[PDB]
Amino acid sequence: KMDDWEIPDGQITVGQRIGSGSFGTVYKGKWHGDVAVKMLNVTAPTPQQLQAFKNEVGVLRKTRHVNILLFMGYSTKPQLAIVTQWCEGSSLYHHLHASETKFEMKKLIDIARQTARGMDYLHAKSIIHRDLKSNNIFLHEDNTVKIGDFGLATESGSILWMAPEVIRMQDSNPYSFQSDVYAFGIVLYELMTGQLPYSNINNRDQIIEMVGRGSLSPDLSKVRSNCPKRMKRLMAECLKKKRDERPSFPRILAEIEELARELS
Amino acid sequence: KMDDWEIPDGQITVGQRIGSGSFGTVYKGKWHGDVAVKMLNVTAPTPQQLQAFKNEVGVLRKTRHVNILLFMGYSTKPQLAIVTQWCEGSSLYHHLHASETKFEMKKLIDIARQTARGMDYLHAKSIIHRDLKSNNIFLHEDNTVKIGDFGLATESGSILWMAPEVIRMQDSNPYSFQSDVYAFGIVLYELMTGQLPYSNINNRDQIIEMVGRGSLSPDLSKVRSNCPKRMKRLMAECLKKKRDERPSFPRILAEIEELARELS
Ligand SMILES: Cc1ccc(C(=O)Nc2ccc(CN3CCN(C)CC3)c(C(F)(F)F)c2)cc1C#Cc1cnc2cccnn12
Ligand SMILES: Cc1ccc(C(=O)Nc2ccc(CN3CCN(C)CC3)c(C(F)(F)F)c2)cc1C#Cc1cnc2cccnn12
Ligand SMILES: [N+]
Ligand SMILES: [N+]
């Protein structure tokens, strides 16, 4: 039952504020070591806010994997809050797009590989991320990928990871395993090029229209010269405009693991 | 309910055998990346073996902390098995007592600190380890302590970590939070001296008798010259012959965290 992960009031020490976001405000904290606490920052949660809290706790409780941010518990007083492990360092987004760090290809592949492990796990439990993007991939201790859904803005933007069908939305719910695969394709692009797609287009509404219609797609000729050819091909497959031509994660993971195994 | 963490048959790939032990046989495996699988290696589990399996799953399910080995799931077919994350490297025992590695003091303190985090967490949930010893402290990636209860023999032996009251056993069940604190004291000794206590005594039965009676205790004059004085004092307190003079983990952890914070 849910109360097994309830942390009684008074035990958590809230420290430095990290950021407010779409899912609450995040702090560093102490509770049997370092933790992160995401607070619903709100005077009277409505029943919808309560349901959403419950939903996040419910899904996080189903995850036990080294590449999924570790859920540790929740509290309902002093306020609504979710507690996770504390990750040191910063996001993949931060490393690629807003830092002097340039990773070696082995490391780039290892990041890809870990990210694929996490996603394969989530898909195996029928969990659809919907917000996979480099800013939701934390490089804990610069080494271990932790996927989360942090809701913190970068230093929609996020429309860069959306599959064509997600942008078009001609049915109610266009999200799927295959849409997460597309987003993962865009993370691969980021890794293998160092860049965000469509850097030479300055109108987010044209990017939206054009990706939706199939007239614009990421320029794969930009991948670095030492990107393995099978990586570039997998990326192309993850980015297929037609949802059902994209591969599934078990195959994605196996093929990346094969690339990583060869580079010693 | 328990079945939420059941992994269906066929999904796990069992690889290299690691060791048989007191709690089953351990293999490296693949399941959405690397895992360890501990197999009950047995043709017809008795009801006691089944209960013990359930007990291990039940306790491991209550743990979500970065310094407790991550439980991931179990199977009941092909055989009884528990699945955890795969730890790279080796045990603390291995590093201190059977390797060329000599750690710096900062690192030794950080190991102490992480181990204290894990133990404080387990005690906060009323979990008594009973087998805390350096061979049950894994240094994952040489950096992150993962406490488990692996049951694998080293390259009782384990009587070295037993508090006097545990050896004497004048009541049925001499185990407690305070007995885990003593064992942690002996891990501190290992860290700060590089050695097992009582290396100049070759009769395990005399060590047993004498620790039980209070006539023999670890020689703390052996700690390395750069061991902080407050560390040496905490170790002395964790090793108190009288159970109730030993500190609790919240205090143990706070004082180690204070030592670690000062060394930058
Ligand atoms: C305190 C906290 C609480 C919660 C979460 C959080 O990630 N929530 C989460 C919600 C849902 C899902 C899965 N769903 C996605 C939606 N989808 C519709 C359904 C499936 C997942 C996922 F991991 F499974 F992806 C995570 C993160 C933080 C953090 C933190 C933290 C830790 N270190 C640092 C360092 C700097 C900054 N922050 N930080
Ligand atoms: C597959 C597997 C399954 C289970 C366990 C296991 O640790 N079980 C466990 C049972 C009980 C308890 C707590 N109780 C102690 C008793 N006490 C009476 C009650 C409280 C805990 C603890 F972590 F909480 F301590 C752990 C470990 C392995 C492993 C592995 C593995 C992973 N990487 C490697 C690399 C090399 C070798 N092995 N390996
Ligand atoms: N990082
Ligand atoms: N290690």
Numbering used by the authors:
A (entry chain A), B (entry chain A): 446 to 600, 614 to 722
From the paper:
The RAS–RAF–MEK–ERK signaling pathway (ERK signaling) regulates mammalian cell growth, proliferation, and survival. Activated RAF proteins subsequently initiate a cascade of phosphorylation and activation steps of downstream kinases MEK1/2 and ERK1/2, which then phosphorylate an array of proteins leading to specific cellular effects. BRAF mutants are found in up to 9% of all human cancers and over 50% of melanoma.
In this complex, Ponatinib is well-defined in electron density and binds deeply into the BRAF inter-lobe active site cleft. Ponatinib induces the DFG-OUT conformation and forms an extended network of hydrophobic and polar contacts, reflecting its nanomolar activity. Its pyridazine group establishes hydrogen bonds to hinge residues and the methyl and trifluoromethyl moieties occupy the hydrophobic and type-II pockets, respectively. The amide linker forms additional hydrogen bonds to the catalytic E501 residue, which however maintains the catalytically important salt bridge with K483, a signature of active BRAF conformation. Interestingly, the activation loop of the kinase domain is partially disordered, whereas, its experimentally determined portion adopts an orientation that docks residue E600 to a unique position compared to other inhibitor-bound BRAFV600E structures, most likely a result of Ponatinib binding mode. Indeed, a comparison of Ponatinib binding mode to known BRAF inhibitors illustrates distinct recognition of this allosteric site by the methyl-piperazine moiety of Ponatinib. The BRAF–Ponatinib structure corroborates the dimeric conformation of the kinase induced by αC-IN inhibitors, with both protomers occupied by Ponatinib.
